[PDB]
Amino acid sequence: MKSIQDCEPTILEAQRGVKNIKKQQLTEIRSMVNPPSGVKIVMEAVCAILGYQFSNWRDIQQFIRKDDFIHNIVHYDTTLHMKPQIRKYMEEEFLSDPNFTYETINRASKACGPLYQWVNAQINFSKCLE
Amino acid sequence: REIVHIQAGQCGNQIGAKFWEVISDEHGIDPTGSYHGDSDLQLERINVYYNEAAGNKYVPRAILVDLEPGTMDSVRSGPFGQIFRPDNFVFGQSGAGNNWAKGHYTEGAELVDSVLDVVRKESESCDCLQGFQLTHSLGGGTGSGMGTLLISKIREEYPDRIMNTFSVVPSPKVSDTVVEPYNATLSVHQLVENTDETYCIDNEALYDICFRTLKLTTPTYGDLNHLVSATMSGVTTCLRFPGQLNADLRKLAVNMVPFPRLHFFMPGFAPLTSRGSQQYRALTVPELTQQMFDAKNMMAACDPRHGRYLTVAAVFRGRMSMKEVDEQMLNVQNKNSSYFVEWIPNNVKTAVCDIPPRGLKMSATFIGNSTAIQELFKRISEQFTAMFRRKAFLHWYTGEGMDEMEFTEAESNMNDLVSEYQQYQD
Amino acid sequence: RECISIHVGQAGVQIGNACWELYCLEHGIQPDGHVPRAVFVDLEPTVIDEVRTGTYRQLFHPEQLITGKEDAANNYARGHYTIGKEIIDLVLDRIRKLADQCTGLQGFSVFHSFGGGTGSGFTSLLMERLSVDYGKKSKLEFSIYPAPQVSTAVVEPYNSILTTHTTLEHSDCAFMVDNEAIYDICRRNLDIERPTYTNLNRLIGQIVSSITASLRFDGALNVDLTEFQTNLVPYPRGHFPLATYAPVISAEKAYHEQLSVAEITNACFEPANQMVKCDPRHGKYMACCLLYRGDVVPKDVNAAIATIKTKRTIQFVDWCPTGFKVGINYEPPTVVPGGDLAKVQRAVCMLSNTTAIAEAWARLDHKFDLMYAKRAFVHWYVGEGMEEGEFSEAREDMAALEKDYEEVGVDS
């Protein structure tokens, strides 16, 4: 084979995921001044992935509040095949702990799920680059 | 609770001038700023809107923003000029050249700090600061460009307060400037994401109502403004008096906006009558409902019937039976039943203050949230494209460093917003 | 001896305010005698302010009119979590300085409503904190529930379905009344065209007196709060009787004073005095507690019940043979001067548990559904700390309360 093939349906997975994120669903998300903890944690994972690293809730509001909020999400990287040091971080902070789990977050908010998949995808892909 | 006004721009300033004229009177405050009101009841909340400077002067807590110095020198010379504190006047110096970009970058971009400051000096005054009213007009210089810049800074500074906006949306069939679509669209995009309540007044619909419902000969700009200023008082202040069912802004807002893309309301006032025929009897409530639900009593030009409503909220203010109120409301929902979106069970959100507005026996503001307002952004969107296509005045913008692609954005964006609005029409 | 009282919410204080007058008036409390025994909580100042201001200033000792300064709102979430959180403490504290004060109290009359913002939210967690500190006392709440047609909110269903599942499991006993059904009476059996939340409040102000005040007056056959719960649950589920009060008659149009036990008693069962827009005429009763007060001599009563018992058009659930505890207190009803009611000499506050309330949940369940089907105002709640759980799961609960009130009929 010429392809490396390792974790390619993860890059069809992360992709269907990024098209699962609706712009009105982002607007609903941005309006929430202080949502459940289940909501908060997903958003932290997003700062780390986008490369804005850590953030407190205050700070997260500041981030999402930017005009590039939707723009950066829909325009986001094809593959983060470069393996940032966010790679081990996002696990030690999120995937390490079961709070960050599809069920918890989903029950939290019916708006989260697609977002949760997309994040998941950027991680399960980051395992095959090693 | 207290809250903090902002008058940007020429319109936005002018209206301001009536508005503090109103309010002031509704707490019997002299022009000098010394209280002489009717009843203690007043005084109790004043706080909401004033600050006491030294046991006498209650000074309005407002901010007065404008780039053309001629402005401020008319307002401070007005009948209620004395009542501000000079610091409050923040003029620019330059002209407010009718260019959104010149406002929203460049000139306004300079002046910002000299506002933002003052708002903190004002915020750290007291209580729990509720929110900001922003009045301003989408046509002028300072309003659409610069004022829309302003909010974006406020909404970063206190990302949890409310933001009421009174925009004087430009009445597409009674024009007054030839950039209109540029000045509108460039701001609306920004607007729709940072503010919690936008109250659109189509300037001529406002004409109309004075020439046809109230019937005066000569509708000055002054008049119109006067009429408007009752309505934004008619919302809020009002609730800052004890009632039977006090429910304001937060409540009010959260009764209205179902989805989160802001949505704009359309104000409607109510016991408004010709001078002569004021004489013929009424004022019992069915007339007030009579008023309100008529298209000729919308201060916004889309006429409801070409849409449905999504939420509607009548804030009354006098003495009366809640039964005859609640009752009306019902009837209305059945008589005009097709004009309501269905999947809201009960639409009306009644609130009922008590105290009457001066000469009246009782009054009652209407704030309707209809899908009929699609037909406003259409107009705008039209005008825009049609000239965007030939890039007509575009250089005056381009020349300030704005790309064209913003022009795409705003358009795109804003057009999609029309889209939304229909999806929940039918 | 006494039994403390909690008014929460935009509404609830108004009710209090009426009632607390009457209440005192009944004992003839000077507008300056031994201090009341309750608290008033609400977050938006404006309501409570009146009570610090109007007549009845002296009457309370300030500490117990607790107020928020912050935005109350009108939506559970906020009211439960976010804001309300701040206050709880201060409140709890008061009821312990007032609990520890009194000796041998019995429970808490809550007045909370599903209207006002707080009314739902707050209460929900208040009742939680009560259940832990005073796990064994009595928790009887008079709630105001939202009518079928008239409504004055749009978050109405949301605001009450979130309160239900929790209050079920913290409360003992919930009275329900609803505005819509009350006006009617005021038109029809009392003939006025001016109802206001201030008139209806004078009314509830009566129904409540029939419990305490009057019980605090001895008479032929006093009843007791335990006695309630005992005679009124019929399973262990914080059940929902509906209240009715009966010689409601307009003064002056009451020269019709050839008015007796038999009548006023018969006058309860008609759905005209239903007290909440559920007609029990096609429900089943299952236990009624007729509290009388004023000149009443048992026999009459015990005869008038026979007649009822034999009126057939009423149904009665099978497996109860007898369900009519009977309370006679003495003390005639007392009438407030501002009021309307006529200075009768005997009155009947009959309360009762009926499978009819299947109705009342349905219309309200339905509402909710629609909207939830669109996810309507959801972001206002989510963004305040609420979870989507709390939504789905508060529907399901109330569903299975609809199943009990269904099941509990037809047992043989």
- Domain residue spans of chain B: 1-258, 259-372, 373-426
Nearest to A104 by CA among A50, A45, A40: A40
Burial class, B232, CB count within 10 angstroms (exposed 0-12 / middle 13-18 / buried 19+): buried
Structure tokens given for B259: 């989805």
Asked whether C262 and C162 are in contact (CB, 8 A), the reply is no
Phi, psi dihedral angles at A96 (to 5 degrees):
-60, -40
Residue C313 sits in the same domain as residue C371: no
Element (H, E) at C26: helix C9-27
Residue C113 sits in the same domain as residue C152: yes
The Cα C141–Cα B292 span in angstroms is 39
Structure tokens given for C151: 């409504």
Q: What is the DSSP letter of B36?
A: -
Structure tokens given for B410: 């705003």
Residue C192 sits in the same domain as residue C305: no
The Cα B361–Cα B358 span in angstroms is 8
How does DSSP assign C231-280, residue by residue?
A: HH-SSSS----EEEE----BTTS-------HHHHHHTTTSGGG-SSS--G
The Cα B316–Cα B329 span in angstroms is 12
The Cα B323–Cα B316 span in angstroms is 13
The torsion of the CA quartet A91, A97, A99, A100, rounded to 10 degrees, works out to 10
User: Which chain B residues touch A24 with a CB distance below 8 Å?
Assistant: 259-261, 420
Q: For residue C29, how many other CB atoms are within 10 A of its CB?
A: 16
The Cα C116–Cα B53 span in angstroms is 36
Burial class, C295, CB count within 10 angstroms (exposed 0-12 / middle 13-18 / buried 19+): middle
Burial class, B388, CB count within 10 angstroms (exposed 0-12 / middle 13-18 / buried 19+): middle
> Which residue bears the tokens 């939680």?
C128
The Cα C122–Cα C109 span in angstroms is 15
Q: Which amino acid is at B93?
A: Q
Residue C122 sits in the same domain as residue C109: yes
Subunits with 3+ C-beta pairs closer than 8 A to B: A, C
Query: What are the residues facing A2 on neighbouring strands?
Result: none
The Cα A35–Cα C279 span in angstroms is 41
Residue C150 sits in the same domain as residue C176: yes
Subunits with 3+ C-beta pairs closer than 8 A to A: B, C
The Cα C203–Cα C207 span in angstroms is 7
**C357 three-state secondary structure:** helix
Measured CA angle at B258 (ends B253, B261), to 5 deg: 90
Asked whether C283 and C240 are in contact (CB, 8 A), the reply is no
> Which residue bears the tokens 């008590």?
B354
**C51 three-state secondary structure:** helix
Asked whether C329 and C215 are in contact (CB, 8 A), the reply is yes
Question: What's the residue count for chain B?
Answer: 426
Phi, psi dihedral angles at C272 (to 5 degrees):
-60, -30
CATH level 2 (architecture), domain B373-426: Orthogonal Bundle (1.10)
Residue C260 sits in the same domain as residue C217: no
Among chain A, residues having any CB pair with chain B shorter than 8 Å are: 24, 27-28, 30-31, 33, 61-62, 65
B237 in a labelled binding site: no
Considering Cα of C6, then C11, then C13, then C17, what sign does the dihedral take? negative
The Cα C46–Cα B1 span in angstroms is 11
Q: Domain count of chain C?
A: 3
Q: How far is C381 from chain A (nearest CA, A)?
A: 8
Query: In which region does residue C100 sit, left (phi positive, over 0), alpha (psi from -120 to 50) or beta (all else)?
Result: alpha
Phi, psi dihedral angles at B325 (to 5 degrees):
-90, -60
Residue C167 sits in the same domain as residue C88: yes
Asked whether B166 and B206 are in contact (CB, 8 A), the reply is no
**Integer CA distances (angstroms), C105 to A84, C134, C137, in order:** 65, 11, 8
Write the CB contacts of B312 (distance below 8 Å, at least 6 apart in sequence).
B347, B348, B349, B366, B367, B368, B369
Query: What are the residues facing B52 on neighbouring strands?
Result: B58
Q: Which amino acid is at B158?
A: Y
Resolution in A, one decimal?
3.9
The Cα B56–Cα B49 span in angstroms is 15
| Domain finish residue from C224, C241, C258 | C241
Asked whether C9 and C115 are in contact (CB, 8 A), the reply is yes
User: Which chain B residues touch C374 with a CB distance below 8 Å?
Assistant: 258, 343
- Tell me which method was used to determine the 3D structure: cryo-EM
Nearest to C7 by CA among C81, C53, C60, C57: C60
Q: What is the DSSP letter of B89?
A: E
Residue C309 sits in the same domain as residue C366: no
Nearest to A47 by CA among A115, A111, A124: A115
Residue C92 sits in the same domain as residue C130: yes
Nearest to C3 by CA among C333, C281, C228: C228
Q: Which amino acid is at B49?
A: Y
The Cα B378–Cα C95 span in angstroms is 59
Burial class, B47, CB count within 10 angstroms (exposed 0-12 / middle 13-18 / buried 19+): middle
CATH 3.30.300.30 fits B259-372, yes or no: no
**Integer CA distances (angstroms), C133 to B143, C92, C363, in order:** 57, 9, 35
Expressed in percent and rounded to 5, the helix, strand and coil fractions of chain B are: 45, 15, 40
Within 13 A of B330's CA, how many CA atoms are on the CB side? 12
Write the CB contacts of C245 (distance below 8 Å, at least 6 apart in sequence).
C203, C206, C207, C210, C273, C275, C347, C348, C349, C350
How does DSSP assign B243-259, residue by residue?
A: -SB---HHHHHHTT-SS
Nearest chain A residue to C380 by CA: give it: A32
Phi, psi dihedral angles at C338 (to 5 degrees):
-65, -25
At what angle are helices C9-27 and C197-207 packed, to 10 degrees? 50
For strand B4-8 and strand C65-67, is the pairing parallel, antiparallel, or unpaired? unpaired
Element (H, E) at C325: strand C324-329
**C138 three-state secondary structure:** strand
> Which residue bears the tokens 């952004």?
B377
Asked whether A108 and C388 are in contact (CB, 8 A), the reply is yes
Q: How far is A68 from chain C (nearest CA, A)?
A: 21
**Integer CA distances (angstroms), B356 to B98, B363, C393, in order:** 41, 7, 44
Phi, psi dihedral angles at C351 (to 5 degrees):
-120, 155
Q: Domain count of chain A?
A: 1
Measured CA angle at C231 (ends C230, C235), to 5 deg: 70
Domain range for residue C346?
Answer: 242-356
Which of these CATH numbers, 3.30.429.10, 3.40.50.20, 3.30.720.200, 3.40.50.1440, describes B1-258?
3.40.50.1440
The Cα B201–Cα B207 span in angstroms is 11
Asked whether B387 and B181 are in contact (CB, 8 A), the reply is yes
The Cα C325–Cα C331 span in angstroms is 19
Nearest to C2 by CA among C168, C130, C127, C138: C138
Burial class, C278, CB count within 10 angstroms (exposed 0-12 / middle 13-18 / buried 19+): buried
Asked if C383 lies within 8 A of A34 by C-beta distance, the reply is yes
Q: For residue C379, how many other CB atoms are within 10 A of its CB?
A: 24
Domain range for residue A37?
Answer: 1-130
User: Which chain A residues touch C395 with a CB distance below 8 Å?
Assistant: none
User: Which chain C residues touch A34 with a CB distance below 8 Å?
Assistant: 82, 383-385
Asked whether B297 and B270 are in contact (CB, 8 A), the reply is yes
Residue C94 sits in the same domain as residue C181: yes
| Domain finish residue from C241, C264, C292 | C241
Query: What are the residues facing B367 on neighbouring strands?
Result: B267
Residue C125 sits in the same domain as residue C193: yes
The Cα B143–Cα B187 span in angstroms is 9
**Integer CA distances (angstroms), C76 to C68, C116, C118, C379, in order:** 16, 9, 7, 12
Burial class, B348, CB count within 10 angstroms (exposed 0-12 / middle 13-18 / buried 19+): buried
How does DSSP assign C194-205, residue by residue?
A: ---HHHHHHHHH
The Cα C238–Cα C110 span in angstroms is 14
Asked whether B12 and B136 are in contact (CB, 8 A), the reply is yes
Query: What are the residues facing C326 on neighbouring strands?
Result: C290
Annotated active-site residue C70? The verdict is: no
Over the range B149-162, which residues count as b (16 or more CB within 10 Å of their CB) and which as e? bbbbebbeeeeebb
Exactly one of C70, C128, C180, C227 is catalytic; name it: C227
Which among C375, C379, C387 is the nearest to A36, CB-wise? C387
Nearest to B343 by CA among B420, B280, B258: B258
User: Which chain C residues touch A38 with a CB distance below 8 Å?
Assistant: 387
| Domain finish residue from C210, C241, C272 | C241
Q: How far is C103 from chain A (nearest CA, A)?
A: 42
Within 13 A of B41's CA, how many CA atoms are on the CB side? 15
Write the CB contacts of C97 (distance below 8 Å, at least 6 apart in sequence).
none
Asked if A36 lies within 8 A of C379 by C-beta distance, the reply is no
Burial class, C383, CB count within 10 angstroms (exposed 0-12 / middle 13-18 / buried 19+): buried
Side by side, the strands of the sheet bearing C285-294 are: C242-245, C346-354, C285-294, C324-329
The CATH number for C117's domain is 3.40.50.1440
Nearest to B101 by CA among B72, B142, B64: B142
Burial class, B112, CB count within 10 angstroms (exposed 0-12 / middle 13-18 / buried 19+): middle
Quick one: how far is CA A12 from the chain centroid? 16
Considering Cα of B98, then B104, then B107, then B113, what sign does the dihedral take? positive
The Cα B60–Cα B53 span in angstroms is 10
**Integer CA distances (angstroms), C173 to B84, C63, C168, in order:** 57, 28, 8
> Which residue bears the tokens 């039977």?
B244
Query: What are the residues facing C108 on neighbouring strands?
Result: C139
Considering Cα of B276, then B281, then B282, then B284, what sign does the dihedral take? positive
Interface test with A, best of C371, C382, C386, C388 (most A CBs within 10 A): C382
Write the CB contacts of A18 (distance below 8 Å, at least 6 apart in sequence).
A73, A74, A76, A118
Q: For residue B341, how many other CB atoms are within 10 A of its CB?
A: 20
Q: Which long-range contacts (CB under 8 A, 24 or more apart) does C342-346 make?
A: C342/C247, C342/C249, C342/C250, C342/C251, C342/C252, C342/C254, C343/C251, C344/C247, C344/C249, C344/C254, C344/C259, C344/C294, C345/C294, C345/C295, C346/C247, C346/C260, C346/C261, C346/C264, C346/C292, C346/C293, C346/C294, C346/C295, C346/C296
**B299 three-state secondary structure:** coil
Question: Helix count (H) and strand count (E) of chain C?
Answer: 16, 10
The Cα B195–Cα B205 span in angstroms is 24
Asked whether B200 and B301 are in contact (CB, 8 A), the reply is no
